[PDB]
Design a protein around this nucleic acid. Structure first.
Ligand code: AGS
Ligand code: AGS
Ligand code: AGS
Ligand code: AGS
Ligand code: MG
Ligand code: MG
Ligand code: MG
Ligand code: MG
Lengths: 167, 258, 330, 493, 318, 257
DNA sequence: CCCCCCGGCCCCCCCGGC
DNA sequence: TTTCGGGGGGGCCGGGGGG
């Protein structure tokens, strides 16, 4: 048989409280103002740097990056402007040299009139490497010049629990 | 689908143009202006430069409101182009500050439409105005003859020596299993001018080129039945194939003589 | 890519000419002399992160060739394929063929060459030797042990030092002029201290500090702003923690450590590093004290690197310091 | 036509043997090979089923093996020519993959020689297929080594294979298909006449007393000896005791040791003394480890308890040194795990060399008390893997009925299954068969699962003797009853 | 500037066997072989920058002369040298017909032969054996152990020793006279000391010092050539007081920009080669250094870890 | 450039001759004398012998001062010859003690000259003497039909058996996947004699040969419309293709009974 | 319309320190 | 034994070109 699809609000209502109350915007992040203020200023400065979020479990790193991408682009343009890779993905040196580099060199997706009228829409895309501390040293080394060369259209965000794992 | 719209009466033509240099360069910036389209790309080894020009006369319809640069990967473009048939018109469509280029194959007789999209890329390569040069020697000959000579001499060696002297062109190749030398002299036929071999020498010339680059260059013989070669000691060799309203040019650097 | 103002400061302030590279005066002078008299040898720039190696080589290429250097050089880095096949075909072809545009010599820049395979490095030997008449090679590295002895034998070595105080000060002054920013002397000293000779850290921290100010056009960057943005301890906090550890009883030391950390949510590792820096200057009557301090604190840092219980680690730091300093009496 | 002057030729060619008697050393092997090839025709007449006095009549292929430069190829060609056969020769310079092997020499196994027909011995029209440098082929299946082993069983014409290392894993397919002929390093006496003749012909002075040394330099390589003489005589026309040491040291053949030799050398106490360590340095010991970095640690861990140490510190018992060595070996195992991880930290290999081999050996170095043994860890690992596979199969057969993991199945369930599956046969004889089958049906167990279960128990509960003691009639009836019924399936594939 | 000055390692590359310094006996043997021909298969081994490629090329040139272009086949690590190459190109060269004087042969020069695959080496065996009447093989390598034993059997072994300071000084003086370089004895001593027996390194450093400063004295040489860090590491490990070792670590290595991984690897090597310390003490030192190396590879590369390593070494030594 | 000068009025003939046996023998010694060119080569397996005769009449201006021997690898020669043209005239030039041979492609209609040099090989293969032998079976059949039968039968077994009896020719191939047979009888047609299968059987014959060798042999079918097969009781089978003034012969040793 | 050449994936085996 | 990554060598497959 088949079941009628549930609404997003109804689905979230019956989710575990950790997922149900995940912050939806930067104002909902609780006690990370020393960084959240800097991130919020980018909505106007439009010069977001490469980011390395690091901290112990359950402090709000993934929530913070998701909320930042939402605020920057909007629910319509986020997907086209974001490439997310985490520990559940393949992230070998070949992947870094081909897929990540190919996405980094692409022209940014075209914003619509509504997107421009309602969101900052900075002229760059975002590559999120969550759980970056699981990546090998050689794969990390393959990212060095890619980050610098295509910084005009791409910005990287690495997230980790153990900062020493990052070269 | 307004800013840039260019119509090819036959998609086969554009497919041939792309095939002429898709094996030389991989990443190309096509600059479209009100006067037409121009592309210029340097291969990875930095030894060969490809320069393509297509005028408005090559198109049934052409409208480019403002100049636009489109960065493309030639392999992907060739893959999309091989989809079209030989009886379909091909429309290239782009919008303001585009992120992609639309290729539209149309068959009015069968009322069939096929639309493909290719995402563009941020290529930070600036077109380099190739200043005109006074070449020591200028020759022209049928494309098939030059391609045959190149393919025959590439079997023997990885380097081919071209020497121009008074009314004579010699192609030499010395290798491990033997050597080969082909002599061609200027000649004109009034019954078959397309087969004429023409030479004009101000100074003698002697250059050496990599065989693989010449093998790639000769792939442009499908665009023009004749090929022109301009050679100078202090300049790169220029191989030109003439299109109806444009041209395809290969600037090849010779090997260091040492 | 709408404007250079949209770039991160680490890239917006990339030197474009050799005159914009600071803190490496000896290397710059020598390489400029080499280029001026046409005596450029094969080069090996070795140094730690963010010292100006890539910037220097790009500026040198621009000086040699001008604005169109990009089409006149062959640049390969760790993000590109550089296997033995690439050496055999692409590098060999570039080294053996004349320039398309001009008649000058050819430059191959192997950035991050310490990531190249041993086979490719070995293949490079005869390419470097055979075509030295018309081609030159530059190799950039942070780790010299990944370079084969044969390659090092063929190169002239230049070492990039950690950036001195004066160079960082001058670049900070230039950035402040460009950005219309105000910086306090104490904040500047703290920024230099946390830089550790890396210019990228200075630029990133300064950008964050500017983002922190309510009115950057009128508010001045104080040391408080730096410590807030970086979430780092103040020197006074480190002094108080160390004094409590070395003078008070266990209850007081534990209370003081917890209070200092909770005031601004400091990380234990930052406190450990600051206290180690302070203790290096302390004059110890017994070598056993220094031995115990170093070994125990290194063990604690290694344990922290893998996570663990924060409270137990703090108590371990306190106990290690007390036990080590009990050796200064007898 | 232009010929080559003898003065232009290498000494090895200028003095290559021309008949079998000029071959120095290995006389028995040469005679054995010659007799085998001489009676190959009779062996064929008897369908290769009757073995003669030498027992070579049951082999259609001969396999000559020995160290480099001792006369394997020379002897093979000489025997082939002496008996008048036509020689078809293949070597490492040729493509001997499975495809080429089947499309090439395969068609020549039962084919006449056109050369042997146009050059006319009764064997002239028959081939002798010589496969030289068999150890020089790479690959497991596409290489064609197994294909050559298959050829060796059905060839209709004589086939001679030549290699250098007969004990390599790649040589396994040739286990017992060919007559193995071993060529050993020839001693100085078997060759002294040859070198003296070469010296007098070449007009340079050579002292006989140093010949034994020269061979020691070349490790019995006659070709290398001739090359050494040719090269040295170019400037030094007299070879005597006044210059033997320098020549030997300059021309010494440095071959990697084998695991037994590595273990013997590393566990010798002399090298760990002041003078010994100064002569054989720590760097030399690390290099010795690197001769075979995969097997050296296993050898050391296998043989470090079988020594009489001579490096014991005062007040230190053999047991304490053994304990220190074991601790270091454990640390080396940790380092090895680090090396073979996802980070591929091969740069740690030298450290491993110290922790796994050099340090424990230095702790227990001395004189070997008994024979040096090959590591038993590999066989035990394979046996454990097999038993774990069987345990997993049993567990997933019984998964539907039980509540546990495989470890719990082994530690807890298996004894009770023994009581309810094996004990009844030993008490009620055949009358229990049904019950046992019932239990099996309740847990989807098969006969193979029954045997595997019986194979797990250790200590006092070993079942082999008990199972063998069961009457054969009871087991036959058990098998009959199990095969005479329908049984369920836990996993439907 | 778009012009290049030819390096002196190439301008003054020896062209004849008499211009090569060091390994006198082997050079005389090569000279005699070139005189009378009958060159055999040979393997030349040695450390970098001592004149192996130079020796082989000079021998080939002096042996063949005008026939050099046709009777020499050179292959190195920068060329394709797979099993297919051995089976086709080398075999064709060996089979080729070439009229040569009564005592000369074709030459195949396989430079950097230690990088060749085992399959190609195996394929070379019977090619060498069958065509020895017209072709001879010269291998040049750094590690002769990489050459399979069957190939070593067919060749003449020539192990090149390291150049002494006297030969290096002689060659440097010759080049200086040819270039009219102004120098001081301390400058040449520093160049030789930093060269460590590598003639190529010595000449490169001399040319760089002349280009950058003109006068070849101690100061300019040390400004162009840095003191090898292995000696600094040895001084660090041999220090008696922990404070002295820490001071050396901080001021001579860490503040100069040397990476922690480089420091720990160099410490391992120096400790291994420290013949002045008892082997057992060296083994304990290596255990501690390996612990620190594993920690650094894990990502914790800090001055504190190296200081702790030094403290543990001093504790062991006391 | 005068010791040996052999001119083919068409370069296609020599290229076809080489292609006829370039897939079986690599190194070949060509002996050129005043009477023409003769070559003999043994395959690697040493069971197939290729003999080639080219008479002076086949050439246009054949000239040989004294007998010469030229050792050539057929791969290099084929690569050189593919650079020519059928209309072009091909001249082979060799000198005294030659280390190489010159191949000259000339075009009469145009003024284009293509000169190539091929390095000679040092080959020390012995020359075997083939004495005339009286075979007990001789069959002449169309080359295309023989190639078709050989290719069809090679698809089943690695060996093919030929049995010749009174006005009957049988080709059998039995392998693992299956078996196949083909039967023919002599036939002659006045209108189309070129398809006339002719058989002369002094005595019945039965032999077996390898499929790969027959596949190599049938590559010469492009040179002659017909092929002549001579079989004896226990002697190599002779497969001959006739040329204008020469021949191409393949002596194939059969598989032992 | 069919056969052959030759570029490109695809699979499988083998080091990995100095 | 073997947890990535690089390199090499051999086997098919299929596009294109030629006949
Ligand atoms: N600063 C925070 N503010 C509000 N909620 C938070 C915060 N941090 C964690 N949470 C809550 O815990 C949940 C998980 O937050 P995350 O952003 O996933 O933390 P995290 O640092 O990414 O965890 P790791 O590093 O993957 S273990 C959120 O959905 C929130 O419900
Ligand atoms: N000497 C310097 N002078 C001015 N800015 C510098 C200097 N060094 C680093 N920077 C700044 O930091 C940025 C990076 O400099 P780089 O030249 O890339 O350092 P690097 O040594 O190449 O780093 P690695 O070795 O790839 S980690 C530059 O764009 C500058 O903005
Ligand atoms: N027993 C021997 N007596 C005399 N000379 C020998 C003897 N063995 C080897 N040689 C000499 O060394 C040369 C080579 O001998 P080979 O028969 O090739 O030895 P090999 O065992 O086959 O070496 P490999 O396996 O190919 S490395 C001979 O031509 C002789 O000159
Ligand atoms: N014995 C020598 N005498 C004079 N110059 C030498 C000598 N050895 C090296 N050189 C000089 O250094 C340059 C390089 O010498 P090479 O012969 O290439 O050393 P190499 O041993 O072959 O180096 P490798 O093993 O390939 S790293 C020569 O061109 C000479 O200029
Ligand atoms: Mg998270
Ligand atoms: Mg850099
Ligand atoms: Mg042999
Ligand atoms: Mg060399």
């Amino acid at each position: 048989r088949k079941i009628s699809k549930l609404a997003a609000e109804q689905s979230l209502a019956q989710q575990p409280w950790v997922e149900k109350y995940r912050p939806k915007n930067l104002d909902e992040v609780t006690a990370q103002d020393h960084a959240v203020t800097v991130l919020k200023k980018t909505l106007k400065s439009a010069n977001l740097p490469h980011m390395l979020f690091y901290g112990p479990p359950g402090t709000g790193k993934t929530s913070t990056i998701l909320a930042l991408t939402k605020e920057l682009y909007g629910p319509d343009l986020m997907k086209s402007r974001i490439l997310e890779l985490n520990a559940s993905d393949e992230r070998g040196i070949s992947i870094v040299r081909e897929k990540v580099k190919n996405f980094a060199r692409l022209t940014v997706s075209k914003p619509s009139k509504h997107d421009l009228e309602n969101y900052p829409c900075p002229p760059y895309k975002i590559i999120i490497l969550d759980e970056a501390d699981s990546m090998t040293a050689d794969a990390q080394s393959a990212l060095r010049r890619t980050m610098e060369t295509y910084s005009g259209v791409t910005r990287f965000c690495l997230i980790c629990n153990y900062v020493t794992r990052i070269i | 689908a307004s800013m840039l719209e260019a119509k090819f009466e036959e998609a086969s033509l554009f497919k041939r143009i792309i095939d002429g240099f898709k094996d030389c360069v991989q990443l190309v910036n096509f600059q479209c202006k009100e006067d037409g389209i121009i592309a210029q790309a340097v291969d990875d080894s930095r030894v060969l430069l490809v320069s393509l020009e297509i005028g408005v006369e090559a198109f049934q319809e052409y409208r480019c409101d403002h100049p636009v640069t489109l960065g493309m990967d030639l392999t992907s473009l060739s893959k999309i182009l091989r989809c079209g048939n030989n009886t379909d018109t091909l429309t290239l469509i782009a919008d303001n500050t585009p992120d992609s280029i639309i290729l539209l194959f149309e068959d009015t007789k069968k009322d069939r439409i096929a639309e493909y999209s290719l995402k563009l890329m941020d290529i930070d390569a600036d077109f380099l105005k190739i200043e005109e040069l006074q070449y020591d020697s200028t020759l022209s000959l049928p494309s098939s003859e030059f391609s045959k000579i190149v393919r025959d001499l590439s079997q023997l060696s990885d380097s081919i020596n071209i020497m121009i002297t008074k009314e004579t062109i010699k192609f030499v190749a010395d290798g491990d299993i033997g050597s080969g030398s082909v002599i061609i002299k200027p000649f004109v036929d009034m019954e078959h001018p397309e087969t004429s071999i023409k030479l004009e020498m101000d100074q003698p010339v002697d250059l050496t080129f990599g065989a693989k680059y010449l093998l790639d260059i000769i792939k442009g013989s499908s665009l023009s039945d004749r090929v022109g070669i301009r050679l100078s000691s202090e300049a790169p060799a220029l191989f030109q194939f003439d299109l109806k309203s444009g041209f395809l040019q290969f600037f090849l650097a010779p090997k260091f003589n040492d | 890519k709408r404007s250079k103002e949209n770039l991160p400061w680490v890239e917006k302030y990339r030197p474009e000419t050799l005159d914009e590279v600071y803190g490496q005066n000896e290397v710059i002078t020598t390489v400029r002399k080499f280029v001026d008299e046409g005596k450029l040898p094969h080069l090996l720039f070795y140094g730690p992160p963010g010292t100006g190696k890539t910037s220097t080589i790009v500026a040198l290429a621009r000086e040699i060739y001008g604005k169109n250097y990009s089409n006149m050089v062959l640049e390969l880095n760790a993000s590109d394929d550089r296997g033995i096949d690439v050496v055999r075909n692409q590098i060999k072809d570039f080294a053996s063929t004349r320039q398309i545009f001009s008649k000058g010599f050819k430059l191959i820049i192997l950035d991050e060459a310490d990531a190249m395979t041993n086979a490719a490095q070995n293949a490079l030997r005869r390419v470097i030797e055979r075509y030295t008449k018309n081609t030159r090679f530059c190799v950039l590295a942070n780790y010299a042990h990944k370079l084969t002895p044969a390659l090092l034998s063929r190169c002239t070595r230049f070492r990039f030092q950690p950036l001195p105080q004066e160079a960082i000060e001058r670049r900070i002054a230039n950035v402040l002029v460009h950005e219309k920013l105000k910086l306090s002397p104490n904040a500047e000293k703290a920024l230099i201290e946390l830089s550790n000779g890396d210019m990228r850290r200075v630029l990133n921290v300064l950008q964050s500090c500017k983002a922190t100010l309510d009115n950057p056009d009128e508010d001045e960057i104080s040391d408080d702003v730096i410590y807030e943005c970086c979430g780092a301890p103040r020197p006074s906090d480190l002094k108080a923690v160390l004094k409590s550890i070395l003078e008070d009883d266990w209850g007081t030391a534990h209370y003081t450590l917890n209070k200092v950390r909770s005031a601004k949510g400091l990380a234990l590792i930052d406190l450990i590093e600051g206290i180690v820096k302070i203790l290096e200057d302390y004059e110890l009557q017994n070598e056993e004290t220094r031995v115990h301090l170093l070994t125990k604190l290194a063990d604690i840092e290694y344990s922290i690197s893998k996570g663990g219980n924060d409270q137990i680690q703090g108590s371990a730091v306190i106990g290690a310091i007390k036990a080590s300093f009990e050796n200064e009496t007898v | 036509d232009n010929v080559v002057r003898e003065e232009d030729k290498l000494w090895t060619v200028k003095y290559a043997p021309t008949n079998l008697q000029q071959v120095c050393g290995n006389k028995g092997s040469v005679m054995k090979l010659k007799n085998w090839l001489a009676n190959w025709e009779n062996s064929k007449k008897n369908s290769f089923k009757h073995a003669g006095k030498d027992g070579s009549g049951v082999f259609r292929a001969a396999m000559l093996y020995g160290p480099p430069g001792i006369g394997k190829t020379t002897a093979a060609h000489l025997v082939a020519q002496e008996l008048g056969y036509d020689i078809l020769e293949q070597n490492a310079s040729d493509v001997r993959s499975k495809t080429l092997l089947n499309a090439g020499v395969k068609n020549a196994l039962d084919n006449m020689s056109v050369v042997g027909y146009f050059k006319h011995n009764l064997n002239g029209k028959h081939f002798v297929i010589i496969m030289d440098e068999v150890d020089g082929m790479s690959g497991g299946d596409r290489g064609g080594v197994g294909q050559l082993a298959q050829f060796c069983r059905k060839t209709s014409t004589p086939l001679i294979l030549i290699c250098n290392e007969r004990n390599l894993p790649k040589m396994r397919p040739f286990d017992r298909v060919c007559l193995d002929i071993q060529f050993r390093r020839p001693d100085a006496n078997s060759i002294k006449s040859r070198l003296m003749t070469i010296a007098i012909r070449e007009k340079f002075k050579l002292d006989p007393n140093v010949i034994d040394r020269l061979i020691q330099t070349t490790r019995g390589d006659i070709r290398q000896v001739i090359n050494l003489l040719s090269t040295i005589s170019t400037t030094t026309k007299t070879i005597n005791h006044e210059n033997i040491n320098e020549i030997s040291k300059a021309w010494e053949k440095n071959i990697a040791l084998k695991p037994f030799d590595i273990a013997h050398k590393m566990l010798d106490g002399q090298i760990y003394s002041d003078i010994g360590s100064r002569n054989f340095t720590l760097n030399d010991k690390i290099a010795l480890y690197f001769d075979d970095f995969d097997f050296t640690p296993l050898m050391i861990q296998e043989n470090y308890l079988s020594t009489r140490p001579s490096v014991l510190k005062p007040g230190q018992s053999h047991l304490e040194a053994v304990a220190e060595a074991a601790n270091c070996i454990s640390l080396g195992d940790i380092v090895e795990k680090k090396i073979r991880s996802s980070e591929q930290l091969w740069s740690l290999l030298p450290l491993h060399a110290v922790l796994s081999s050099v340090y424990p050996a230095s702790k227990v170095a001395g004189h070997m008390a008994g024979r040096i043994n090959f590591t038993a860890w590999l066989g035990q690992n394979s046996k454990s893997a097999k038993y774990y596979r069987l345990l997993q199969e049993i567990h997933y057969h019984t998964r539907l009925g039980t509540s546990t993991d495989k470890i719990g199945l082994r530690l807890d369930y298996l004894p009770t299954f023994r009581k309810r599956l094996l004990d009844p046969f030993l008490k009620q004889g055949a009358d229990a068969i049904s019950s046992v089958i019932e239990v099996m049906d309740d847990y989807y167990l098969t006969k193979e699962d029954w045997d595997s279960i019986m194979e797990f128990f250790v200590g006092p509960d070993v079942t082999t003797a008990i199972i063998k003691k069961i009457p054969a009639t009871v087991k036959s009836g058990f098998t009959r009853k199990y095969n005479s019924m329908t049984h369920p399936v836990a996993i439907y594939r | 500037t778009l012009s290049l000055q030819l390096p002196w390692v190439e301008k003054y590359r020896p062209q004849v066997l008499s211009d090569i310094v060091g390994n006198k006996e082997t050079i005389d043997r090569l000279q005699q072989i070139a005189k009378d021909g009958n060159m055999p298969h040979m393997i030349i081994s040695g450390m970098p920058g001592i004149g192996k490629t130079t020796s082989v090329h000079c021998l080939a040139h002096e042996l063949l002369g005008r026939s050099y272009a046709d009777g020499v086949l050179e292959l190195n690590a920068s060329d394709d040298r797979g099993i297919d190459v051995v089976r086709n190109q080398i075999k064709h060269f060996a089979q080729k017909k070439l009229h040569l004087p009564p005592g000369k042969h074709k030459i195949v020069i396989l430079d950097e032969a230690d990088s060749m695959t085992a399959g190609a080496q195996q394929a070379l065996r019977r090619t060498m054996e069958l065509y020895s009447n017209s072709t001879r093989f010269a291998f040049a390598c750094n590690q002769s152990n990489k050459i399979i034993e069957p190939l070593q059997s067919r060749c003449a072994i020539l192990r090149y020793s390291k150049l002494s300071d006297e030969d290096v000084l002689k060659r440097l003086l010759q080049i200086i006279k040819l270039e009219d370089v102004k120098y001081t004895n301390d400058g040449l001593e520093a160049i030789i000391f930093t060269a460590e027996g590598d003639m190529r390194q010595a000449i490169n450093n001399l040319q760089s010092t002349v280009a950058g400063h003109g006068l070849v004295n101690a100061d300019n040489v040390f400004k162009i050539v840095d003191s090898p860090h292995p000696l600094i590491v040895k001084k660090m490990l041999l220090a008696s007081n922990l404070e002295d070792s820490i001071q050396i670590l901080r001021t001579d290595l860490w503040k100069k920009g040397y990476s922690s991984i480089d420091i720990v690897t160099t410490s391992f090597r120096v400790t291994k080669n420290l013949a002045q310390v008892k082997e057992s003490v060296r083994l304990e030192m290596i255990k501690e250094i390996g612990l620190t190396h594993m920690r650094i590879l894990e990502g914790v590369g800090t001055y504190l870890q190296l200081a702790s390593m030094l403290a543990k070494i001093h504790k062991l030594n006391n």
